[model samples]
Target chain A: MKQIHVIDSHTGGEPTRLVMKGFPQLHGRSMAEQRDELRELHDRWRRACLLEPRGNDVLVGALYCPPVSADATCGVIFFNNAGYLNMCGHGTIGLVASLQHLGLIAPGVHKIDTPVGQVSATLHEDGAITVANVPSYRYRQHVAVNVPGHGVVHGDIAWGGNWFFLVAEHGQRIELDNREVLTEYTWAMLKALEAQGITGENGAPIDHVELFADDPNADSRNFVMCPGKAYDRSPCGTGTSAKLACLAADGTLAEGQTWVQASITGSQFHGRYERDGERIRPFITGRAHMTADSTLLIDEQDPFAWGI
Target chain B: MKQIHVIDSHTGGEPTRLVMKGFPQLHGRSMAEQRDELRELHDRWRRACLLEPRGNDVLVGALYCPPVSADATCGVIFFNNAGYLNMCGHGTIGLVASLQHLGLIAPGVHKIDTPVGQVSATLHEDGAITVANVPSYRYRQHVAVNVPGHGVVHGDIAWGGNWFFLVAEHGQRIELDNREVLTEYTWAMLKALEAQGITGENGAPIDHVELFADDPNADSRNFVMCPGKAYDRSPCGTGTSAKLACLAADGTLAEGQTWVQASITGSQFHGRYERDGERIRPFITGRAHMTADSTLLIDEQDPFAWGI
Candidate 1:
């Protein structure tokens, strides 16, 4: 029997399972290399922790490892039910909070390394975490594509730790109950983008589709369709960073001016960015609650050793 | 901040979070009265532990309590995201296994108390659990329901702890990916049944819809749509008991003959029944794995105090 000790927390409303122990040693030195090794050598371990019977599709996993650089506070490989992620904005916030909850890290600033690059997180006294994300940029603006049923929709291609087809307008209300429609419309937009071959830099296929709408309560509301085929419960860390990048590029939002971004689940995150020459460095501030401290047990004899 | 300690286990891929501590004192003596009090008094606690950010829809919760009748080993008020349950077949199996895992019980037959009545569970050395469920009966057989878009679907209304509209043929395969179609047809059938005013004994509305199909590997396969709007990952315990009752009443299966029941997740359960005159008592044997032992943390300051 193998036991995977975990501490689960929710940033905004999205769940993050931060692994403290029970994973085997990685074969690679770099975070990306280790992520690939995880996929190749321990896909069963992935299924056991990320999928149903242990974790659901919406649950994002962050495995803690020794930082590649000595100066970094820790290292992480973000993943979900779909596959490994280069970087997760919300996962970083949640992971920092989890580390604080475990008394591993104090409520202060810390440097964290990801597959993408080194990011910094600040644990405030008010329990909010501010994650200084990687340099984000709007790759393209006003990209048009005709969805088969929804007519032509224009969006910006952006990178904020992950590839996204960022749509400022898609003619859809962002609400909790309106999830199905949002997913449907967002997926259609993705399909349309695919049909038009509107790929990100280096032809990286868009893994997320961000749909933005009005919110009387917050600055704006968004419904992000993730690669795992689920909506992010949080306001979406990377998404807001991407939004901030787009705002910076278009001069809609001033540098260091916080934009309150809301999710379909009514969770909010304060997003801001500072221009670093042409690209922008975004910061997402969100609160997370430590929800569960548990051990995921795996038995060799169990039929669903990897889950169905 | 309050904490709810939980032990999570999977019985045939279905999750059961057996709550070991953190529930408040109950106001009633009887299990059924306590169940009502739980729903009426602490629905927040229900959503806190049962819904997303803490638990999902498919996760069933069993609150361990002192048995109303001192002779029984323990008492439980079964619940889910939907509402409180009188009894849970798989939950009972998972609960016994969890107790044994916690060193609370030895491997032997133990009487358990539910809101419905007392049942017996035997924890075998091989880790399989056999639960002798409450008295179940086929209330009405071969009832026709005219579903919209789909033709009239025939099913049996039965009580196996909970009311179920059990269908023998629903013109759908019982594969995992075929869940949407099965849920669609089953929900339509439920609507049709409501239109016809067909219900279980005493006009109790059917809460579950069980669809049956043939499986080459097992005696039969089932797709059970739970009240929580999710498909059962396990060969549903009460559903299997209800199936056994119908089979016993119809002379299709001999008394004490084991029937291998398979779930949509490819998990199987061994079902048998003993004739109790008109009503039949069912024994369902299933395997469960102790997957997670954890604490559910709740803070009043958190935005998702009860989850969105």
Candidate 2:
């Protein structure tokens, strides 16, 4: 049996276990095309990475490629244990910073080309990196998607590449301000998305909903709707980006503006948008921090189950 | 003082507080366009929401806006104690479920739109929601981005909207595999780009690199370089999309295929390329899950103080 090395990390509250190397050649020119090619080729390998032991049911993932567009600083693809996302803002932040720290970019300011569009990021004075967000646009105003028996609520839905958001009625309670509670509630919301044709393996749902605190001093508090519970211990990322779209849509936010988005654990992202009106896609910007670069030991002897 | 309602949550790991009610209007067209219009307006809110007893420097936040995309989903804007994000993914998932449970997205299946793009979601049989991811593409693959003392190295980069990924040598531990030390001492290969003069940040020299992985599960795992660990808190969504871009660029992947990516936490996504083309823009598909929902309350007398 061969040895395995792995890299691990998380964004928002989602987790991503990247298999940095060891794949055969594929057919394609850009990351997007590469994903397409892989979808046709070594899909079994993809499954192994996303399944139990090595992975779980809710993990989001990715693969590395080259930028197809000249404006792209680099190229990449988005994936989950089960599927791929059109775009992911939080993932971009982590990936960009990872590339820079891993000595992928020339260092200093790097331009990262993404599936949504081109984004500019810079290494900060504090060792942190800030990415220039893509353009974003909100489409509508508060509309109630009332539950059959629940109380009436008004929410805003926004778009971000493939990401999206749904802001619900805030008039509920003060506990909604707590990150812990928010996470739980957020999961409840994301799980609710399954009523549509979209379905997960166990007939579960996707993660979504990223709420926050009214005050800045507290841990950036919010919840993530995962396939399970808020603390279901699954990976979730793009679901957060969708929430931002909802904000932009309801607020009618303009590009070139900056705001703060956070996590229940207090982690936060300083976000901005690059509004060029270049295409239908929106560019998002934010800062990514580094935690560690560790390796994982996978034994070929066992069923590859290591509790995720 | 006037009473205010607030809701909070964590997308992936990022924190978000929804100013559910009592906020200003976000001006825009569709929910997609409105996200862009609300940023500047939200900056002020960030200051207010992220400061004082109610908030702290690490906190992130968001406010509600109208869904402009003509979808049945609700709309919301994201914010942190510091600033805003270009988009969010997990947040959308949570919001979808919560909205439906909270009666925000009535009739079960609500169309969610955000700055990232748009997603159609609904509750699942198990009370979970699944999302349809947007377009995806890979950006780069094994390329050289020289790190001065580190010598020449190769890594893969992928894109997801504004997100990017720089992967380490796949399938193997640099310090272990290929008998190459992870530090500059072991690897000494370099590649240069034809185009120059594109400085990163702070005038740091920029160079691309080449990379490969050596692992038993080389076909499964992927690596991402997130400098500051921006994705440390949660699995990344957009980051995975960027990886697809990198895969496509290397011709290791094809279009019109689907795959699953996983995070260390065991969460997975059912990723697929919805639209196929060579253009910089690509679409991806996946399922998101929503778990639960609850009411969050705000204290009118609470002081807020959070900063980026």
Candidate 3:
């Protein structure tokens, strides 16, 4: 079997792999063009690389391509077991950093471009680098929903990279003594939202979505969702962007702020949002880091490619 | 006050800023440690930036720091309008890419670390970088609640960076023909979850959480829940990881090998799960990307230290 190398990270615990090497052509020039080419010419590679042999249904992928416009220093296309995605925040963090280390940028600072627009990134004196993200806004607020665990929950909605549902502190009630209740309530709430066609970044219906339950009895109530029939095995990055949008719209968030949200195992990623635009197209920004990377040897004959 | 230069991005609509220059001290060693340090030291900065002057709610932040453990090459810290989060998915993507572009990693490949574990990253000959996140799992999958729009929504709980709640696609029914239902459902769900004592990534209880409706007439019911009180207004990355965990569980999913999850704006994120470690720990993965970045010009007299 041939050898292939890769990189990895997570957004709010949603796992992502920015495929760096061992693949064939990305098949396009602009990020958008590359996105089109992947679907038109080489989407099969995504299924093969994102599934069994290399990944699975939940796997998400990011491929580098030329920027949609010349203004961008670098461009990327996101993919998952299901198909292509419009954006990803966590992935960009790792991607930019990786690109920086690879000397992809001219040095000092550069624009890591995407279909949305160009984001400026600056290399710090320290090895760390930071970049600005797209514009953001609070799309809505004081929304209401009834969930299993928390009934009559109130929430706010916003758009940073996309759209997000921001729940208020008083939106729900928790009973610490009964851990099962938390799981039940969380799932119930998610179910209520799902039924309403309320989703994260992808506009996926709730039937295709899922959750993760941290408690043993919770039974998978807490985690990323597989909201589509052809969902990728990798978790999502843009989903977090939508979440940021919800926060931004609620008048609760400010630009260039940071926060740490944890997973069931308590693992976490640093999240931040910023507004870059001044006109009608205001933008929000943020970054991610490579928390870990390892090697996985797969059998070449594995029947993992499903994109065919 | 010190001046800092920063960049931003919003993948799939989530806003994030990759801190580029002028960060004096992270205040801690490990991501968690740094999180704590920020909570004690610079937390006020987040509040000032997000709550007043420059920010409200609905913003997110991502920070890079030295790995707390020897195993990790780097770590990411998060903050937002709400408060501090344990992780973020979108943030990771943007940061990783930036890291590579900045020449942060040694030649070849490296295992960057975060609060969760060590993630792997590869530098491409083209100067692009791919970062692989840690292993993920489906924590649980079961019925939680029955939403008005979506019926009999099943929750899939998976792990990526943190714990997340993913509802089934069928759940999108609640918002059919009417988008306001989404906002109503979000709040109701939040209330229900909080009533049950369910705490989200930030560990904030329902009492401290808040939500709003961004698009009253919008058709898609999709938004992010702060799950509790938000410090900085950004969606937590680790929370996204947790969502992937539940979705990737064996019984949590059905009908296909992949799925696509969407945000309120039709943006999407991919997710997948795999079982390894002799049925012990499962792995979840996803895709990420960086979309844009903007520079924030700060004034010391602005009162807010960071973006607002």
Error of 2 at A287 (Å): 4.2
Candidate 3: fraction of native contacts reproduced:
0.00
lDDT of 1 by residue, A1-308 (tens): 78998999888898899999988889798888888889899888778898888887788899999889788899999988878888777788888999888889888888888887888899998778888877899999999989877888899999987888888777787888889988888887787788889999999998899988888999899898986577788778788888898888898999879899988898899988888987898988998888888888887777886777
Query: What does the lDDT come to for candidate 1?
Result: 0.86
Write one digit per residue (lDDT tens) for candidate 2, span B228-292: 22222223456556555665666655665655554423344444343357533333332332211
- What would the per-residue lDDT of candidate 1 be over residues B1-308, giving only the tens digit for each residue? 78998998889998899989998889798888888888889778878888889888788899998878878888998998878877777788889989988999888888888888888889898778898877899998998888899788788888887899988877788899888888887877777787889988888988899988888999999998876566789988889899998888788899889899999998999989888888998999998888888878887888787767
**For model 3 chain A, where is the 10-residue window of minimal lDDT?**
A299-308
Q: Tell me the spans in candidate 2 whose CA falls farther than 4 Å from its real position.
A: A66-74, A106-127, A132-134, A145-150, A162-213, A218-257, A273-292, A296-300, A303-308, B1-308
Report the TM-score of chain B alone for all candidates. Answer: 0.85, 0.62, 0.63
Give the top-scoring candidate (DockQ).
Answer: 1
Clashing pairs in 1: none
Candidate 1 at B257: error in angstroms? Answer: 3.0
For lDDT, the strongest prediction is 1
RMSD of each: 4.0, 28.0, 19.6
Off by over 4 Å in 1: A107-109, A123-127, A137-174, A184-218, A227-229, A249-252, B120-127, B137-174, B177-218, B226-229, B249-252
